[PDB]
């Protein structure tokens, strides 16, 4: 009664030892506010500076220590790469959007790159301006979303290079980010006009919209939660960075509205559906704050903050399948410095050395539930869940 009931109030961060980091990485200097890092249980992908065009560095997780300056990179784009994202149903497939107004999907060999990779599997061209937002569908196989500076959203079939749907008359200004929902039937988007929209791609209609979700002129974000709510970070009129929870059934007022501080840089939220924990990380900040999303008011409970001494240029989150369960792992973050990638360890302090059933519910697996053709017809399915108990050692 005195203390709010939770399992994550004492989660603490712990940077990994130096010998397990990744040094000598020319991290990208693109002003675009993306994650700059995508990681799966097999590989690590980091956007880097190339002398000409654009490239991103893909290396196996075991390839720790210093990285050769001449290490092969995925240099196929004629412009700098903006966003990268691994395929949730294929650990060797990664999509990338760049300044060249094209989206490329690559196939990574099981051992990585021995020679620079220039030819992509398929070239997605549907945009007139740069593409900075790429989001794989959570359940539909070979379905990819692309959003560019031309304020148009496209649904892609990487299997057949076919444009399923085109959404061009729904965003009047710049798109900040796009996130699918739990079952992937809808997606939320934060726009430069300070408006948050929930859009159905199959029907091409605006399900819900909230104008002036945040009064500030600085960029804002919006993600979908497991229960169907939308978590948004933004700025107020007084340049105050804020967090907010929204209900698609009544957008008149947010359930919660909490201010954090008066710093610059957008807030990049990392949501963990199993633990209902959102990790709010600011670009250029040296601290990571994580909050627990619950039904009890004020619906946003600050847990704790990991603090460091180096500003972050990018950050990537390992999915549930890649964490080491035996040491009470809930999240591992690959914080990006200017010349180094430092994994970050977040644990729940537990006395028992056995498997924790409550900490690890079933997670979405690498098996796609639906297919591209079935998804277009009107089928909706939840992701296939797997058990992490087999990963316990």
């Amino acid at each position: 009664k005195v203390v709010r009931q939770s399992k994550f109030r004492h989660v603490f961060g712990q940077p990994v030892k130096n010998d397990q980091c990744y040094e000598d990485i020319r991290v990208s200097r693109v002003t675009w506010d993306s994650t700059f890092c995508a990681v799966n249980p097999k590989f690590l992908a980091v956007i880097v500076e190339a002398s000409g065009g654009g490239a991103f560095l893909v290396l196996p997780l075991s390839k720790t220590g210093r990285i050769d300056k001449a290490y092969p990179t995925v240099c196929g784009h004629t412009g700098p790469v903006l966003d990268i994202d691994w395929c949730p149903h294929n650990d060797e497939v990664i999509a990338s959007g760049s300044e060249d107004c094209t989206v490329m999907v690559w196939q990574i060999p099981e051992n990585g790159l021995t020679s620079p990779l220039t030819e992509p599997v398929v070239v997605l061209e549907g945009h007139t301006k740069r593409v900075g937002i790429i989001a794989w569908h959570p359940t539909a196989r070979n379905v990819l979303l692309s959003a560019g500076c031309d304020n148009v959203v496209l649904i892609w079939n990487v299997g057949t290079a076919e444009e399923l749907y085109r959404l061009d008359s729904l965003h009047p200004d710049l798109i900040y980010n796009v996130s699918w929902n739990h079952n992937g039937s809808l997606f939320c988007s934060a726009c430069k006009d300070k408006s948050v929209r929930i859009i159905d791609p199959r029907r091409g209609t605006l399900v819900a919209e909230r104008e002036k979700a945040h009064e500030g002129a600085r960029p804002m974000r919006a993600i979908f939660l497991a229960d169907g709510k939308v978590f948004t970070t933004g700025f107020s009129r007084m340049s105050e960075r804020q967090l907010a929870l929204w209900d698609p059934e009544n957008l008149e007022e947010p359930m919660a509205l909490q201010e954090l501080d008066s710093s610059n840089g957008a807030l990049l939220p990392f949501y963990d559906p199993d633990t209902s924990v959102v990790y709010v990380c600011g670009k250029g900040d040296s601290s990571i704050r994580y909050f627990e999303i619950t039904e009890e008011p004020p619906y946003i409970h600050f847990l704790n903050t990991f603090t460091s001494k180096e500003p972050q240029r990018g950050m990537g989150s390992m999915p549930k399948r890649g964490l080491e369960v035996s040491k009470c792992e809930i999240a591992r973050f690959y914080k990006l410095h200017e010349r180094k990638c430092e994994p970050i360890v977040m644990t729940v302090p537990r006395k028992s050395d056995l498997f924790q059933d409550d900490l690890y519910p079933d997670t979405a697996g690498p098996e796609a539930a639906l297919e591209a053709e079935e998804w277009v017809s009107g089928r909706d399915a939840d992701p296939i869940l797997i058990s992490l108990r087999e990963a316990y050692v």
Partner: protein
């Protein structure tokens, strides 16, 4: 309603969060009979031991800030909850205080007893020097607390503590009380038993003071009787003390009186500041905060200002902040912190401690 417990070496202050003064202030002693009963309770704690001290052997469970015997320590806490506060410990969260640079082993026992023996719903431990700064409403200053067991000098700047600059002095009220006995036998009064320890301690709290000029005060006391005071013993006998009034507190500034090689409290405060960064020494000079019962002597603030000024550079402004309620500064600061709306995120649950252990109390604290 949260409980604020300040367990010192000599005194234990307890109360409720939000109040202005501790509700229960009793000595931290445990007494056991030393004679045989001939007429048809094997231990006494607190004031009940003080009243019957004529037949008891008084023992302090805390000595020099370390817990000599935990079995009597639990009796002190048991007396606090059930006999003094008269509340159920399993209903109210408890805010606890610890000495600066407290050993983690000592902290582990303190939280384990609360969660397992008394079954408190929530618990938290805070540094006594920090609360003493809360009571004065400051965010920057060097806190020199002087209780019964030990003396600490903790410089804090803008809410940031400097552990490397924290200094310790094994010299406090109990050492002064023992020193007063050694010089009282010079005048012909013999106090030897532990029962007489409280009598001498009461004399120190009522007749002792700090002289601005120690050598001059000897000259005045050696040629005049204006400095002599009379005290009535519990048996009705009246004793008179002269220069012993200000010679006993002088051990704080001249530890050589006790054969100690360490420096006085004024130099310990000065040495603590010099161990800090140069850019913050200016604010620490003007925010010297006194704490504890051993800093309640008359004229101790004036002597402290004079001594530090002679050590500090002439261009610095020395300010000795001595609030009149500094005897309860730690508890008052504890009540203030336990009432703030930003402190409820620091509580450590009993359930959380069961599944995590003492790893979570080492964190979330300093």
């Amino acid at each position: 309603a949260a409980l604020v417990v300040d367990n010192g070496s000599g005194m234990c202050k307890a109360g409720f969060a939000g109040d202005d003064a501790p509700r229960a202030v009793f000595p931290s002693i445990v007494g056991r009979p030393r004679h045989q009963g001939v007429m048809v309770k094997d231990s006494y704690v607190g004031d009940e031991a003080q009243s019957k001290r004529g037949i008891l052997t008084l023992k302090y469970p805390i000595e020099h800030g370390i817990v000599t015997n935990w079995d009597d320590m639990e009796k002190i806490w048991h007396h606090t909850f059930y006999n003094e506060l008269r509340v159920a410990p399993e209903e109210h969260p408890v805010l606890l205080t610890e000495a600066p640079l407290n050993p983690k082993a000592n902290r582990e026992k303190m939280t384990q007893i609360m969660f397992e023996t008394f079954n408190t719903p929530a618990m938290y431990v805070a540094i006594q020097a920090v609360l003493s700064l809360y009571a004065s409403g400051r965010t920057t200053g060097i806190v020199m607390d002087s209780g019964d067991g030990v003396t600490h000098t903790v410089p804090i700047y803008e809410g940031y503590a400097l552990p490397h600059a924290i200094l310790r002095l094994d010299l406090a009220g109990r050492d002064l009380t023992d020193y007063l006995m050694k010089i009282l036998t010079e005048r012909g009064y013999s106090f030897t038993t532990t029962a007489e320890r409280e009598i001498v301690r009461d004399i120190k709290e009522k007749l002792c003071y700090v002289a601005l000029d120690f050598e001059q005060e000897m000259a005045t006391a050696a040629s005049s009787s204006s400095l002599e005071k009379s005290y009535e013993l519990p048996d009705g006998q009246v004793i008179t003390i002269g220069n012993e009034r200000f010679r006993c507190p002088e051990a704080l500034f001249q530890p050589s009186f006790l054969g100690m090689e360490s420096a006085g409290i004024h130099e310990t405060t000065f040495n603590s500041i010099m161990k800090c960064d140069v850019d913050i020494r200016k604010d620490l000079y003007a925010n010297t905060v006194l704490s504890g019962g051993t800093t309640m002597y008359p004229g101790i603030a004036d002597r402290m200002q004079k001594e530090i000024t002679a050590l500090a550079p002439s261009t610095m402004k020395i300010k000795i902040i001595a609030p009149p309620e500094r005897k309860y500064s730690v508890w008052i600061g504890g009540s203030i912190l336990a009432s703030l709306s930003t402190f409820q995120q620091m509580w450590i649950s009993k359930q959380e401690y069961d599944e995590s252990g003492p790893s979570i109390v080492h964190r979330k604290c300093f």
